[PDB]
Design a protein around this ligand. Structure first.
Ligand SMILES: [Zn+2]
Lengths: 178, 189, 61, 135, 325
């Protein structure tokens, strides 16, 4: 029997506890896997058993809990246990432009927008979920959708105003046989 | 016993496909003495599937502009054409009609999916009711077109088209059009 | 080969002008393999079809 | 042709999956890493430079290396995931994820997943300018 | 076998085990779940409705106001208690059951109240969740008439009086451990785990304390001797002047204070379901976000959302470019 262990940071312990039933129920019911949370090592431990239906169910469960621990909604990672062409590519903000301090801070701001609106609008065009951890950006969707999402986000954190990015991303969605 | 035109048996015909068995209403319950019933089959959706197939053929033959009111003349045409069918083949002419209809309807068709400007048509399946409608319309249009300027009478070309469509030969206009739409759709996919 | 189909339930009307119908497809080959398909014309729940290629899948996602 | 081991014990290899920002490499090798069993990059499958980096080419390369492993008798694999690193991006793309997923699908026992990516302690200068990069 | 509404919610089809299946009309007519009501019209009808003689309803009330469970229970829960008390009285002799329930004993420990003991997936140093354990994990599981009570206050007063209580499992329950909330201002306990203001004094001062009741009739209550729990760090902070109007969010200081209605749009509070059989024909993997409504502009949030932000104390330093709505 083979297993995977997925670490949890301290800001993801309480979401892991409140959302715990919603985590372990689809893993053990529809994939038939053993699961626990090692508190001493602070790892979510997912293990194959006799009742597993097929191979690469445990990799689905690992991607499910990884997407949850990075900060996605539990429903959006139930999308990982269901769907097959969903991946997650992440990058730091200073992987595009060297930003320091308040400039870097404003970068985060103009990814998010007021109320989060910009973020949500990007999600509505590229059909992805974006999560902005402290200086880091995580995208979830299809491959071409993830590269559209990176194009929009990278234009946002090399300076362009959100209106230009909105127009460009809707045009790119129109030319992409969406 | 109920007979078409006083003479045509209806318990002897059979439907070869189960796809069109619920849409061609000729067999037992829906057989009648004359095609001319003047019933409301366009009152609501899917109601015309219960209309007998011979009345559908009569209605799609009076479709064109000068003959746009004449149904008694059209049912006369259908009576003479069925008589010619029985004289040529000897089979029950209703079964010949049913074989023509099931052999003439296209199985898939191309469709504009997208917007006005995207000329890439997608091949999609067809409804069995749409298949029956298109088979009826192509048979009537082929019979119409083949007998425009010639000595051959409308009923004669109609019977000949029904023979080629039921037999499956590549002489019917309807089977040629069916092959054309089907191969265009197979090119699209 | 030719694989005949059954309609389980009709999803909706799709297309540019709403001339396509997205339906759920059951097979009469004693298989529970239900697949989504798009058709042209009027269909209802309980129609029986004739599908030339069963390998084809509809616009899913 | 291969090791003379019973059906119980597995003969491990190490799988170096390297997901570049232009293609993806699959290098199966010894536990030492010194001698190579197989390596199928993404461009050995798709005949287009645009799709060297796709998860599709990554999947195909994973099937190829798995087939070659069952030829030579390797049954189980340790995995070292990798992106470019150094000055550049640290998190591996969907190419490595797709290769890992499809390779796990194709009958391989999977051992330990380790991220061996070159994180510098402290770096040289970035390939971009001050003015920025990536469109 | 007196069925509480918890049995009907849980779809506990235990009508074959017992024969004295009786219940109130009020507990079954208050259920708002559609699937349970559909299941009610399918089940074999051997259950019978009754109403207890009100004298035992008083008697149940005067000892529930003594055991410290009276504000927690509902009227219908008193109806269930009175019905099972009367069925016990009519079927079994009444000398078995005792009154004037026993005094609680106090025993404190060092563990924090938030220590996740007795949560199934967790493991301190094996405890796994197998496909064989999901039907098993309901609660702490261990003759003619019983109960199907799942609320802890029900089991508390029942095991205090001495009625044998059973579960969705057929075997009767011997031990019942749970958590309660106790006020550190007026020392009045509540069995409702949802409630954050005290019932007596009305202050936001309830803290978690564990309890366990035996089948004998003993209640023993475990405190936490940890100075983290009773520390007034972010409790004094200056408050804004009270604002009215349609958009004001006052800091929520009393339980029954009146808020203006700021509800999310129906599009925004919809989550994506992937187990639906019509999901794969859907255009996007996820539900579209709402960016067009007025509540999107007003930045209305779900009430549960942003909980760890509130537990940060207000006299502290947030980052310099963030704003807390
Ligand atoms: Zn109080």
């Amino acid at each position: 029997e083979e297993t995977r262990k997925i670490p949890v940071p301290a800001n993801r312990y309480t979401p892991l506890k409140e959302n715990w039933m919603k985590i372990f129920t689809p893993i053990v019911e529809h994939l038939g896997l053993q699961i626990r949370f090692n508190l001493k090592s602070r790892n979510v431990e997912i293990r194959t058993c006799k009742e597993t239906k097929d191979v690469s169910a445990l990799t689905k469960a690992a991607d499910f809990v990884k997407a949850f621990i990075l900060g996605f909604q539990v429903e959006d990672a139930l999308a990982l246990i269901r769907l097959d062409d969903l991946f997650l590519e992440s990058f730091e903000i200073t992987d595009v432009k060297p930003l320091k301090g308040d400039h870097l801070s404003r970068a985060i701001g103009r990814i998010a927008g007021k109320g989060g609106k910009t973020k949500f609008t990007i999600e509505n065009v590229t059909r992805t979920r974006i999560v902005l951890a402290d200086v880091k950006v995580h995208i979830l969707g299809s491959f071409q959708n993830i590269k559209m999402a990176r194009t929009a986000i990278c234009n946002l954190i090399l300076g362009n105003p959100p209106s230009k990015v909105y127009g460009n991303i809707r045009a790119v969605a129109s030319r992409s046989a969406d | 016993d109920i007979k078409l035109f006083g003479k045509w048996s209806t318990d002897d015909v059979q439907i070869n496909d189960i796809s069109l068995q619920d849409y061609i209403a000729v067999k037992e319950k829906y057989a009648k003495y004359l095609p001319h019933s003047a019933g409301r089959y366009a009152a609501k959706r899917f109601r015309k599937a219960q209309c007998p197939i011979v009345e559908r053929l009569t209605n799609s033959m009076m479709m064109h502009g000068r003959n746009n009111g004449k149904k008694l003349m059209t049912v006369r045409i259908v009576k003479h054409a069925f008589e010619i069918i029985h004289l040529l083949t000897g089979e029950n002419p209703l079964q010949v009609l049913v074989n023509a209809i099931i052999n003439s309807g296209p199985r898939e068709d191309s469709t504009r999916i997208g917007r006005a400007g995207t000329v890439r048509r997608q091949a999609v399946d067809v409804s069995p009711l749409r298949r029956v409608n298109q088979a009826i319309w192509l048979l009537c249009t082929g019979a119409r077109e083949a007998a425009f300027r010639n000595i051959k009478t409308i009923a004669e070309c109609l019977a000949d088209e029904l023979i080629n469509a039921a037999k499956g030969s590549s002489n019917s206009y309807a089977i040629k059009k069916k092959d054309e739409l089907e191969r265009v759709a197979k090119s699209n996919r | 080969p030719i694989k005949l189909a059954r309609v389980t339930k009709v999803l909706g009307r799709t297309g540019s002008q709403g001339q396509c119908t997205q339906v759920r497809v059951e097979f009469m080959d004693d298989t529970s393999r239900s697949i989504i398909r798009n058709v042209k014309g009027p269909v209802r729940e309980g129609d029986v079809l004739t599908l030339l290629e069963s390998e084809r899948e509809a616009r899913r996602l | 042709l291969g090791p003379q081991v019973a059906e119980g014990e597995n003969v491990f290899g190490v799988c170096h999956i390297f997901a570049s920002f232009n293609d993806t490499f699959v290098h199966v090798t010894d536990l030492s890493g010194k001698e190579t069993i197989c390596r199928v990059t993404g461009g050995m499958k798709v005949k287009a430079d645009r799709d060297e980096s796709s998860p599709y080419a990554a999947m195909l390369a994973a099937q190829d290396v798995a087939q070659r492993c069952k030829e030579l008798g390797i049954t189980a694999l340790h995995i070292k995931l990798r992106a470019t690193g150094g000055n550049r991006t640290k998190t591996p793309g969907p190419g490595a994820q797709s290769a890992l997923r499809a390779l796990a699908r194709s009958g391989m026992k999977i051992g330990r997943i380790e991220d061996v990516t070159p994180i510098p302690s402290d770096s040289t200068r970035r390939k971009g300018g001050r003015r920025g990069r990536r469109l | 076998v007196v069925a509480d509404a918890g049995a009907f919610l849980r779809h506990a089809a235990l009508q074959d085990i017992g024969k004295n299946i009786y219940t109130i009309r009020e507990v079954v007519t208050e259920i708002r779940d559609k699937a349970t009501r559909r299941r009610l019209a399918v089940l074999p009808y051997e259950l019978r409705f009754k109403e207890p003689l009100p004298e035992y309803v008083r008697l149940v009330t005067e000892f529930s106001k003594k055991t410290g469970d009276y504000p927690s229970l509902s009227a219908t829960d008193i109806q269930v208690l009175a019905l099972t008390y009367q069925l016990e009285a009519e079927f079994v002799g009444v000398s078995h059951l005792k009154q004037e329930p026993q005094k609680v004993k106090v025993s404190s420990s060092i563990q924090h109240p938030e220590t996740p003991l007795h949560i199934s997936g967790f493991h301190l140093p094996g405890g796994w969740i197998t496909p064989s354990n999901i039907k098993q994990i309901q609660q702490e599981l261990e003759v003619r008439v019983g109960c199907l009570t799942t609320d802890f206050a029900m089991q508390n007063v029942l095991l205090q009086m001495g009625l044998h209580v059973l579960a969705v499992n057929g075997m009767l329950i011997r031990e019942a451990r749970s958590y309660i909330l106790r006020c550190h201002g007026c020392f009045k306990t509540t069995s409702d785990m949802s409630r954050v203001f005290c019932s007596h004094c009305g202050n936001k001062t309830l803290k978690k304390v564990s309890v366990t009741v035996s089948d004998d009739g003993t209640l023993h209550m475990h405190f936490s001797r940890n100075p983290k729990v009773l520390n007034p760090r972010g409790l004094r902070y200056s408050l804004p002047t009270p604002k009215g109007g349609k958009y004001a969010i006052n800091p929520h200081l009393t339980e029954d204070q009146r808020f203006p209605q700021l509800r999310l749009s129906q599009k925004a509070r919809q989550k994506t379901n992937v187990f639906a059989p019509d999901y794969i024909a859907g255009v996007s993997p996820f539900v579209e976000n709402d960016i067009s409504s007025r509540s999107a502009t007003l930045q209305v949030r779900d009430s549960t959302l942003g909980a760890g932000r509130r537990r940060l104390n207000p006299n502290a330093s947030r980052k310099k470019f963030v704003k807390k709505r």
